[PDB]
Amino acid sequence: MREIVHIQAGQCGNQIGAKFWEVISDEHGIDPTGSYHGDSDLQLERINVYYNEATGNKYVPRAILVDLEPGTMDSVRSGPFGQIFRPDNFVFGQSGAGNNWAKGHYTEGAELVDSVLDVVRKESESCDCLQGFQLTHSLGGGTGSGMGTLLISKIREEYPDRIMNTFSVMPSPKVSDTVVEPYNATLSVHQLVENTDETYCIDNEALYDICFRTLKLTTPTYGDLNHLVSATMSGVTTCLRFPADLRKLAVNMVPFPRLHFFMPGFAPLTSRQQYRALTVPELTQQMFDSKNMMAACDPRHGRYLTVAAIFRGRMSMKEVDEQMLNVQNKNSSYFVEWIPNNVKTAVCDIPPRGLKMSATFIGNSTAIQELFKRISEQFTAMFRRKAFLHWYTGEGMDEMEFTEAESNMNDLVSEYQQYQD
Amino acid sequence: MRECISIHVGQAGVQIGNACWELYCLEHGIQPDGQMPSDKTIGGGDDSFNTFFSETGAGKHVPRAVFVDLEPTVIDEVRTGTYRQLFHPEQLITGKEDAANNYARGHYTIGKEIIDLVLDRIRKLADQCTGLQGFLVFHSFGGGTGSGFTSLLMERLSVDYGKKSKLEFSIYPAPQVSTAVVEPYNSILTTHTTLEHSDCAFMVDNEAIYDICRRNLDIERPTYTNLNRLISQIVSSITASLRFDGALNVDLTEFQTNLVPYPRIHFPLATYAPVISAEKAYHEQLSVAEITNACFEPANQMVKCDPRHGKYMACCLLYRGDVVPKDVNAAIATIKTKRSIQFVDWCPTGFKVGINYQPPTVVPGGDLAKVQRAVCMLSNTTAIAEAWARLDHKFDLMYAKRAFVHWYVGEGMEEGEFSEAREDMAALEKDYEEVGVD
Amino acid sequence: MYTFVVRDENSSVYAEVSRLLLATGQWKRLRKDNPRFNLMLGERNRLPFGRLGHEPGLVQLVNYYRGADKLCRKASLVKLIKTSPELSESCTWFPESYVIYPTNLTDEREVFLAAYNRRREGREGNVWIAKSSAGAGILISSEASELLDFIDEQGQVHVIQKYLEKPLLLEPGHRKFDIRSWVLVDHLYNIYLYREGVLRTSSEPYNSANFQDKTCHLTNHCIQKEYSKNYGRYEEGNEMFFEEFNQYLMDALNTTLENSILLQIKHIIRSCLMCIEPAISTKHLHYQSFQLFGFDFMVDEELKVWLIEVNGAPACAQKLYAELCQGIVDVAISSVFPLAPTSIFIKLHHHH
Amino acid sequence: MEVIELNKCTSGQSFEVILKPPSDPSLEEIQKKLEAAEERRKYQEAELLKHLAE
Numbered sequence A: 001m002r003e004i005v006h007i008q009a010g011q012c013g014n015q016i017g018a019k020f021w022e023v024i025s026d027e028h029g030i031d032p033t034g035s036y037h038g039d040s041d042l043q044l045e046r047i048n049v050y051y052n053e054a055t056g057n058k059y060v061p062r063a064i065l066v067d068l069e070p071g072t073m074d075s076v077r078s079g080p081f082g083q084i085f086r087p088d089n090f091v092f093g094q095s096g097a098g099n100n101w102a103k104g105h106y107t108e109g110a111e112l113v114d115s116v117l118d119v120v121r122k123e124s125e126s127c128d129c130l131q132g133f134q135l136t137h138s139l140g141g142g143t144g145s146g147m148g149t150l151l152i153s154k155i156r157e158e159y160p161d162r163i164m165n166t167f168s169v170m171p172s173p174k175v176s177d178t179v180v181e182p183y184n185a186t187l188s189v190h191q192l193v194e195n196t197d198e199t200y201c202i203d204n205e206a207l208y209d210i211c212f213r214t215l216k217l218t219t220p221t222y223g224d225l226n227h228l229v230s231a232t233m234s235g236v237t238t239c240l241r242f243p244a245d246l247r248k249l250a251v252n253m254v255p256f257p258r259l260h261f262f263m264p265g266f267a268p269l270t271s272r273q274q275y276r277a278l279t280v281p282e283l284t285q286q287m288f289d290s291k292n293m294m295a296a297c298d299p300r301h302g303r304y305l306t307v308a309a310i311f312r313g314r315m316s317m318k319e320v321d322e323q324m325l326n327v328q329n330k331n332s333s334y335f336v337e338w339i340p341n342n343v344k345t346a347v348c349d350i351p352p353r354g355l356k357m358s359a360t361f362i363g364n365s366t367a368i369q370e371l372f373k374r375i376s377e378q379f380t381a382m383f384r385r386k387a388f389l390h391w392y393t394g395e396g397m398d399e400m401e402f403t404e405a406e407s408n409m410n411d412l413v414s415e416y417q418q419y420q421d
Numbered sequence B: 001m002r003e004c005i006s007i008h009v010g011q012a013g014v015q016i017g018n019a020c021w022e023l024y025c026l027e028h029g030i031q032p033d034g035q036m037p038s039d040k041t042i043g044g045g046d047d048s049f050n051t052f053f054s055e056t057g058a059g060k061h062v063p064r065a066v067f068v069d070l071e072p073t074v075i076d077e078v079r080t081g082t083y084r085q086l087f088h089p090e091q092l093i094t095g096k097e098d099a100a101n102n103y104a105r106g107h108y109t110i111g112k113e114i115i116d117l118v119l120d121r122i123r124k125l126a127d128q129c130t131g132l133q134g135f136l137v138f139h140s141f142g143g144g145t146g147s148g149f150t151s152l153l154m155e156r157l158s159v160d161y162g163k164k165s166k167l168e169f170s171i172y173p174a175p176q177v178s179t180a181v182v183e184p185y186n187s188i189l190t191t192h193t194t195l196e197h198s199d200c201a202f203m204v205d206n207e208a209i210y211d212i213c214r215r216n217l218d219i220e221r222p223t224y225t226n227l228n229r230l231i232s233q234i235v236s237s238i239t240a241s242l243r244f245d246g247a248l249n250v251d252l253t254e255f256q257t258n259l260v261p262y263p264r265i266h267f268p269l270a271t272y273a274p275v276i277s278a279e280k281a282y283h284e285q286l287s288v289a290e291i292t293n294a295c296f297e298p299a300n301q302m303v304k305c306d307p308r309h310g311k312y313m314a315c316c317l318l319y320r321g322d323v324v325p326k327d328v329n330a331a332i333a334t335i336k337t338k339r340s341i342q343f344v345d346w347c348p349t350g351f352k353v354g355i356n357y358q359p360p361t362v363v364p365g366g367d368l369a370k371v372q373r374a375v376c377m378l379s380n381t382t383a384i385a386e387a388w389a390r391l392d393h394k395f396d397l398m399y400a401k402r403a404f405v406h407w408y409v410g411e412g413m414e415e416g417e418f419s420e421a422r423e424d425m426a427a428l429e430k431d432y433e434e435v436g437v438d
Numbered sequence C: 001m002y003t004f005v006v007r008d009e010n011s012s013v014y015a016e017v018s019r020l021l022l023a024t025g026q027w028k029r030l031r032k033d034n035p036r037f038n039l040m041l042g043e044r045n046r047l048p049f050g051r052l053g054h055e056p057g058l059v060q061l062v063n064y065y066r067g068a069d070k071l072c073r074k075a076s077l078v079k080l081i082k083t084s085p086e087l088s089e090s091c092t093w094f095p096e097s098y099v100i101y102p103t104n105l106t107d108e109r110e111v112f113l114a115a116y117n118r119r120r121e122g123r124e125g126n127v128w129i130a131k132s133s134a135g136a137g138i139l140i141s142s143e144a145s146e147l148l149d150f151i152d153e154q155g156q157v158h159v160i161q162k163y164l165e166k167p168l169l170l171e172p173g174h175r176k177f178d179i180r181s182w183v184l185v186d187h188l189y190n191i192y193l194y195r196e197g198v199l200r201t202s203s204e205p206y207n208s209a210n211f212q213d214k215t216c217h218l219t220n221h222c223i224q225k226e227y228s229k230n231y232g233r234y235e236e237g238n239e240m241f242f243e244e245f246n247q248y249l250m251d252a253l254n255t256t257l258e259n260s261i262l263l264q265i266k267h268i269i270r271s272c273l274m275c276i277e278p279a280i281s282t283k284h285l286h287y288q289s290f291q292l293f294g295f296d297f298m299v300d301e302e303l304k305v306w307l308i309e310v311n312g313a314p315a316c317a318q319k320l321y322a323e324l325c326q327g328i329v330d331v332a333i334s335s336v337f338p339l340a341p342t343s344i345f346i347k348l349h350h351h352h
Numbered sequence D: 001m002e003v004i005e006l007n008k009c010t011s012g013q014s015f016e017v018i019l020k021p022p023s024d025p026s027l028e029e030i031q032k033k034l035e036a037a038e039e040r041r042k043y044q045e046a047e048l049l050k051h052l053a054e
């Protein structure tokens, strides 16, 4: 009984989190009211990892919904699987965060953080053996970025020896709400560099290009972007929900404590020629292709420290090994040669809803430094002129704190750069 | 009669332990409920099979075994599997979260908290023995429990049972069946701290078992069940002398005597033949010479290496089935004139031979076919040092960058224990070279 | 797309094979420490054989046979011949040799002196030659005292073997020579003999009354091009190829190179390689091996061929690099890793 | 090629063929190692909490 406590904070965090519980609830045969109605025991084997079992064989997700304004979580409560969440696990304010990291982390968020931790403590205490935590949020806003990182900090204080895992949506000027996103993202990345064991970097620009160029969606929406994040979140967690361990995963994926920012990938990504079968070579060629990755980083600009793949569906496991060992042995210049056998492959028999077989890609690549470089550049472009700083200094923050975040992220890039050589 | 307590540590040791004890029951005519009709002394006796099974007043034959794992999902199979009735609950010990492939986590962090409990359950088994021989310890090199808790258990066993022999069955890490990148660290950490505490250790390279399963058994993608059943045949061959009437390797002390002239060099190479697919229409039964000659084919060694370029310090031939000494010597003579068998000048050029007339037992519905005769060769070649070289090299690649080291330091291990352990393996590699090279 | 790694930058042969492999556009070279390779052009000394053939899903091939040093070492070759029933001690094509350890260190000092005293007493030609693998350091002499005292002044194992006092001398010139044959053995242990050989000739007239000046007795390409004053006079670079040497044997001796010499060469090549096949074969191994060999022969005035030594890392004649290196890729490398004639070799069939 | 020490019984026999003649830490010290690593874990967690408290 290795339980995971899930937390979703802010607009992005709850909208992406909502669809995640909608996707896996479908895979485990849980309907919108928590009643199981599947046809396979594999669906219930690892069901307690993400679900609590209530009276009457009801399964309630182990999720804590957090936000500083009531709007988004009212949507979740009214959405498809809204009724499946525990009423007491909705913790929210009324002031909002104004896309301000200082408001979510020091002022507004600080007033609300304790009531969230009471709910976390309530869920952890009822866990037979808590694996760790997973947080979904964006870094470019205020609540999921500012307060999200405040939560991670207070969770690591109370549970220092539990794994802290996040799915983090990185800002991008292409799909950007406010100009202060570089500020909020830079301030959060430093928190994540210190207090998370694994962070899956999701770039809205990558999610956009996939929806535009690959999926052929003329006008992508946030909903379309979240469908990709749901499908990815379901893929990376397949090892945890079906017939392994968060700490075991971290051990084999993270060779250096600060370089724990992953690039995920999904395959297939077909446009509506959607019924055609996808051979194992196609799953493998696409899964490693940059166009299938959501970090908006060209892996051919760096090197993989470690790579993990999960294949879902009834396929030729012998042919899986042949194709994976073909991508490695045909591009080994992009894999560091000082970590032997740093490419691992796993198979799961249950495919996602509506796919005969799929493949999820998880890579610890030094190409991710390109993401932090872009953020660092946008940060400096405004900070050199102190543009929009008054929004943050008005919440008690000092310019010194910005100068440090800048340096912290530039040190992070220097660290990635040295292992790429 | 002297008893042998088997200890299974980690997932690899528990599942291999499960496969062996299943085979032992099939060999000794013991049913899943623990009953043994052929045993006419109800609730007692000092037969050869009593070295591995105790008896209750109710005629139950209980393995002298302890299963230890830091996480419970693997032992729970034993608790509810076919042979759940053989063991009582005190013999099955499971924690709630594993060592996460982290040696330091199994040796220090978790091991510290569970070591005295294991020693207490083992003491209970020892209290049923009128003359305990020692322990057989099954574990993996790569797992965090298999490596980290095993080495702590060996250190304590040397304290609590100083005059008892300890043998290992160690699973050498292979990328084809492992998803852990840090197993080279764990393998070298545990070999370092276990070396002075183990009298004789049988390494099984998962890479070897895997190809034997693909090649001889035509299993395109073998599973742990396939590997474990094959591994339990070799284990059964190696422990048969302790469980059956005989005169060769009749107690654990005789393994070091016949196979280990130098204490540090206590890693015999195991070679088994024949392995025949049960799905075959029907195989031509191989002769004593043919299966003996197969013992010098790299393709059926438990560790892939080239004995033609090492030196033999010892050599045991353990035959099971329709074999008479006349055929053995005929095959040996023919093999000397053809093969490359160079012994160390300070060791005789001979072969200790043991024959057990009962042919190998095979689990029904298994993968191995029923053969009329089989042999398992135990030879102490310097050629097995290749396995240390390979493993030591992978260690060096990662340790040069300190990759993954923070995970061990974070559990309380000092970084110097890495270099101290690597230096010990470098010495171990030097010993093999001083012995087998001119 | 196949991958190979280079671990011997000083290999003129495999520098060409590597150059050719890249030219096919279907071979990709990797860093010398990258384990995910199909082909390894390995180092001469301490090649890590124990690390080959352990990469999942990679058929790995190496250009050296583990154990061939038994054949390509002065003292090793002598012990192999004297202790192998296939070669026996009465091997008729290998000069009477003895392994002698310097007195500052089994050893055949006494056994060499017995055969020496026998020749001295029987009025027979008693001129021997001392040499070792640690040479560029050779000594030719008819006195046993000088031979043994020369090895003690050194500190490595040496070998004393009979000096062919009646070598076949080319005319005009009255000059010694040796024959270099290139033999490629593939992963299946087929023995291919390069149709092209070279005679490394001495540009100085052979002089049997003065072994002090070693420029007319030693036919090494470096000694002739350094201490010989007639270098390149009769043939370019003191190198005569089989076409010229064959025509000479017809005009002078009324015989052919095939009948008078090549039959014995092919016989000697087979005998040496078949002997060690059980020890070095990679038939049932987890990796495959091939290797190019340089066999060195001497020919006496009776047209009897003698084996001098076997080089495990030989170079090639400048004019024969292209053809031979291509042959290595064709039969040795592409036979295992095919790509998307009239062979240059002579298969020396044998029983495996 | 000599055979020696031939032992026979109902379930088998064993012998020896020769082809050629020839030519710890105490319980206390373990506890110290374990308690030292536990002390290093406690110190590292104190620095983490001290960091978080700052």
Ligand SMILES: Nc1nc2c(ncn2[C@@H]2O[C@H](COP(=O)(O)OP(=O)(O)OP(=O)(O)O)[C@@H](O)[C@H]2O)c(=O)[nH]1
Pocket (backbone or CB within 6 Å): B009, B010, B011, B012, B013, B015, B016, B070, B098, B099, B100, B101, B102, B106, B140, B141, B142, B143, B144, B145, B146, B147, B171, B172, B173, B174, B177, B178, B179, B183, B206, B209, B224, B225, B227, B228, B231
């Ligand atoms: N032959 C064989 N090898 C196994 C088996 N189970 C695991 N292994 C190997 O053991 C290594 C991993 O060690 P595990 O035994 O799984 O780890 P552990 O001992 O349970 O320790 P933890 O890290 O706490 O889980 C890998 O190389 C596996 O291939 C098995 O049943 N048979």
Ligand SMILES: Nc1ncnc2c1ncn2[C@@H]1O[C@H](COP(=O)(O)OP(=O)(O)CP(=O)(O)O)[C@@H](O)[C@H]1O
Pocket (backbone or CB within 6 Å): C095, C129, C131, C135, C136, C161, C162, C163, C164, C165, C176, C177, C178, C217, C218, C219, C220, C296, C298, C308, C309, C311
């Ligand atoms: N027993 C012998 N009788 C006659 N000549 C001999 C001889 N041993 C050596 N030589 C001469 O020495 C030359 C080769 O020497 P050797 O091969 O032993 O040294 P080496 O190995 O450094 C040269 P390489 O390896 O390039 O052929 C030949 O040209 C030959 O003329």
Ligand SMILES: Nc1nc2c(ncn2[C@@H]2O[C@H](COP(=O)(O)OP(=O)(O)O)[C@@H](O)[C@H]2O)c(=O)[nH]1
Pocket (backbone or CB within 6 Å): A009, A010, A011, A012, A013, A015, A016, A097, A098, A099, A100, A138, A139, A140, A141, A142, A143, A144, A145, A169, A170, A171, A172, A175, A176, A177, A181, A204, A207, A222, A223, A225, A226, A229
């Ligand atoms: N993929 C995705 N990104 C979003 C979504 N909503 C907001 N974002 C991104 O998140 C950032 C804004 O943060 P937001 O979650 O709205 O702020 P918060 O509610 O205060 O935490 C911007 O970079 C947006 O592009 C969403 O539904 N999906």
Ligand SMILES: [Ca+2]
Pocket (backbone or CB within 6 Å): A111
């Ligand atoms: Ca307020």
Ligand SMILES: [Ca+2]
Pocket (backbone or CB within 6 Å): B039, B040, B041, B042, B043, B044, B045, B046, B055
């Ligand atoms: Ca009894």
Ligand SMILES: [Ca+2]
Pocket (backbone or CB within 6 Å): B158, B162, B196, B197, B198, D024
């Ligand atoms: Ca001891």
Ligand SMILES: [Mg+2]
Pocket (backbone or CB within 6 Å): A011, A141, A177
């Ligand atoms: Mg918003």
Ligand SMILES: [Mg+2]
Pocket (backbone or CB within 6 Å): B010, B011, B071, B098, B143, B145
């Ligand atoms: Mg385990």
Ligand SMILES: [Mg+2]
Pocket (backbone or CB within 6 Å): C309, C311
């Ligand atoms: Mg030479």
